[PDB]
Amino acid sequence: IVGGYTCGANTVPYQVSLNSGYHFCGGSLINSQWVVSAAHCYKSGIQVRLGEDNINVVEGNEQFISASKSIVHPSYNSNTLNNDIMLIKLKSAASLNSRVASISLPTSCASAGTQCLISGWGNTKSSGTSYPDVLKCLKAPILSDSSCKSAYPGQITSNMFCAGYLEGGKDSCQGDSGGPVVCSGKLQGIVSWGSGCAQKNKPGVYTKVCNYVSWIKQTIASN
Ligand SMILES: NC(=[NH2+])c1ccc2[nH]c(-c3cc([C@@H](CC(=O)[O-])C(=O)[O-])cc(Br)c3[O-])nc2c1
Ligand SMILES: [Ca+2]
Numbered sequence: 352i353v354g355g356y357t358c359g360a361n362t363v364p365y366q367v368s369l370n371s372g373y374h375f376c377g378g379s380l381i382n383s384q385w386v387v388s389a390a391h392c393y394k395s396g397i398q399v400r401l402g403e404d405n406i407n408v409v410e411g412n413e414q415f416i417s418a419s420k421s422i423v424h425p426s427y428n429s430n431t432l433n434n435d436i437m438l439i440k441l442k443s444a445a446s447l448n449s450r451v452a453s454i455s456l457p458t459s460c461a462s463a464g465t466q467c468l469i470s471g472w473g474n475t476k477s478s479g480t481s482y483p484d485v486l487k488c489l490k491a492p493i494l495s496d497s498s499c500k501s502a503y504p505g506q507i508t509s510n511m512f513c514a515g516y517l518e519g520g521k522d523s524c525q526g527d528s529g530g531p532v533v534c535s536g537k538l539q540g541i542v543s544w545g546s547g548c549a550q551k552n553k554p555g556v557y558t559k560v561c562n563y564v565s566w567i568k569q570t571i572a573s574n
């Protein structure tokens with residue numbers, strides 16, 4: 352997260368870290384046995400780490416659970432990142448409490464101007480790499496579809512939306528991919544891509560979760 356602030360320990364109880372001997376992507380807990388992340392974060396040997404704040408220190412509240420299976424959307428296109436979503440089923444259910452909790456799926460899509468909270472342990476530098484130990488937060492608004500298409504002509508599908516600041520300075524970045532974009536307590540987006548991080552007129556692009564609720568429910572119901 353570039354230009355964000357320190358969230359504060361366990362203030363984002365649905366945030367998870369996907370770990371393969373190091374933190375490589377974020378995710379969101381949607382029930383005690385399932386996490387939603389981005390399809391381009393897929394790999395084998397994933398360990399999901401819940402109740403984390405400092406990912407390099409075991410401070411208490413952490414729950415490390417192996418993924419039993421990862422389900423990448425069948426229509427995911429790694430060249431356009433269209434349908435950049437994946438579901439991960441945990442080997443055992445997590446114990447939910449105040450520090451580890453699920454986030455709700457939306458019933459409707461959000462409008463432009465809606466303010467959202469984006470969080471993650473991704474890079475905090477737009478020009479260089481600096482990875483934090485604790486979780487960073489950023490409040491960002493969803494931009495209009497016209498501004499988003501204007502910024503990324505020919506690259507925005509109906510399953511994506513832009514959120515951020517055209518002036519640059521504040522944005523999500525590599526390492527934050529797969530993590531949550533929550534607006535009014537509902538998971539509206541998944542960190543997916545952008546051109547660099549926090550560059551002027553190049554806001555972040557997110558997977559539009561409201562377009563996948565039925566797919567998510569049907570897939571969880573059958574697995
Ligand atoms: N500006 C954003 N809102 C944003 C969000 C998620 C991103 N994820 C990435 C991302 C970048 C890389 C680098 C590779 C590198 O420098 O090592 C690349 O350009 O391919 C790789 C991954 Br995988 C990303 O998710 N960039 C991102 C940018
Ligand atoms: Ca820790």
Ligand SMILES: [Cl-]
Pocket residue numbers: 500503504505506
């Ligand atoms: Cl266009």
